[PDB]
């Protein structure tokens, strides 16, 4: 069930197919959740995407705090901070040297059927 660093596993390469890869490292990724001013919700902002304060340096905003966020379209939007969410993830390396950081559910052990 648990995956450890140094373990050969199976996961999708960037080209979209399953290959054997090796777990390089277990990382922790912190995601921010915010409610935009129009009421739309985001669950996977990075701390650096908050542009009204320096969260990389001083941690997350207070729950409910007004913020501005730089969105994936490069534009800035008004929002309110909802929650911060650390997630255990797996940095994997493929045969060709390419790497990805993936979630537990996207990793398979060598003995298991690929769905």
Numbering used by the authors: 897 to 1011
Give the article text:
KDM4 (JMJD2) is a conserved iron (II)-dependent jumonji-domain demethylase subfamily that is essential during development. Vertebrate KDM4A–C proteins contain a conserved double tudor domain (DTD) and a potential zinc-finger domain at the carboxy terminus. From our biochemical and structural profiling, we find KDM4A, KDM4B and KDM4C DTDs display different histone-binding preferences. We show that these DTDs use an aromatic cage as a general mechanism to coordinate trimethyl lysine and, most importantly, the sequence specificity is largely determined by side-chain interactions with surrounding residues.
In all the structures, KDM4A-DTD forms two lobes (HTD-1 and HTD-2; HTD, hybrid tudor domain) with interweaving β-strands. KDM4A-DTD, which displayed strong binding to H3K23me3 as well, also bound H3K4me3 and H4K20me3, consistent with previous findings. KDM4A-DTD binds H3K23me3 peptide at low micromolar affinity (Kd=2.2 μM), slightly stronger than its interaction with H3K4me3 and H4K20me3, and KDM4C-DTD displayed highly specific binding to H3K4me3 (Kd=6.8 μM).
